[PDB]
């Protein structure tokens, strides 16, 4: 198989900042449309909007029409967010709560060991002291973290005190959601202009330079992530040094052409490349070894 | 066994300049491919390149193809160096660092007393004040030198100031690597034209005559180093006196024919022959005696 990663073995778990994307959510049993892919997310919220009649026939037809010939997924998800927000004050919004909390539940009932190893290694990293952020609305990881008895809370960008106090890292055992959480419907912001107004403080992205300048990330199930504008604006807007980065990322192998294409474009971004077997079943053993040597040397 | 060397006994250890080659690295437990033989080094790098996918299948196939029907081993190692160097600026080159630092580690875990006596007597020679240079990429000797508490630095030909102040022998307790070191990936140069441009100063090779003209070397695990072109380029190009040399070299005995052919050819070069017992086990006692008598008379 693929042996121990050269750099990863010697990095301290403190500097390790794990990032989880659609790959880990797809490691969970793929029967919920929300977790197979990002495309199946918007399809899931569609099916939830049609069956719960939040949205009349013609405009569900429009949003479906976006699906076949598609472009600009994040804008379309934002157009959705905007059209489902005519609410007055709170009114326990049935246009929001009763769609996201329909789509993103029924998740635990389809949990197996093959995805379970991922988050148990994650709990090993957190008990080492590693910081973790995610890119999905789901909340399965911290639910099963609470399953064995480790309380893990969901954070967002709306709560200013928690974001301000989270950048300095004193609050360990905490996972920030760069997109949102279904357990807190008022805490999701996705449009590019929505996370800029709450981040009006230029001193608080001075407090985020400690993530990208010095701390080491590890993008799991990513790569299309570095393509959309959210990570460019939260990571690469306020830093001009691509010559000396310490960030890492893990994806599948496959056809050699896109292999070298991703190689070159995220060397231009400045992350290291790791592709191992595209077998969908050697990532568990490889990543759980990674975590255990990290914990032992840590 | 083989008693004390007639000439060596009376040499003061300052005149002694120890050279270590593939024999000492093979004295270490021979299960890393890198240290059993020079041949074994390039296959270790080839195996590292295949499993980490620096080169595609066909390039690795060509590289494998040179192995079976071989020639120009240093030339092929340079071809490997050139094709693994498309990097931009530094970019913590994954084509170099993540290959050499994979191959040349996992070395200390296989360290035993039979190889330990060699380096511990080496430490004796250093505390006498002898000079030592190496011909292999490894840094096991300096690592275990630092094990008991003696700090030993790895030097190369790239840093011009260190090489300039090193030829005078003002800097003691220092070891240059005629080939390179794995702890400094940017400090390795092997192709014949690489160590001439950095050595553009003919006055600095005039500062090198004090090695070959007056200082006494002692080549351990050598004999094939006087066959390739690096030793001839750095030693015999600027020296025209083979009538009066003062240099030594130690190797195995064996077939009498090959014994006398090496005898004659390196008498033509101008070194003394010592072949003892090819038992792979009386070199420790013989060389450790040699070193203790030199230290006592030093």
Author numbering:
A (entry chain C), B (entry chain B): 28 to 325
Paper text:
Here we identify family with sequence similarity 118 member B (FAM118B) and FAM118A—two understudied vertebrate proteins—as vertebrate-specific sirtuins with similarities to bacterial antiphage sirtuins. We show that human FAM118B forms head-to-tail filaments both in vitro and in living human cells, a feature that appears to be conserved in both FAM118B and its paralog FAM118A across vertebrates. While human FAM118B and FAM118A have individually very weak NAD-processing activity in vitro, their interaction leads to markedly increased activity, suggesting a tightly regulated system. As expected, the FAM118B sirtuin domain comprises the large Rossmann-fold subdomain and a small α-helical subdomain but lacks a zinc-binding module.
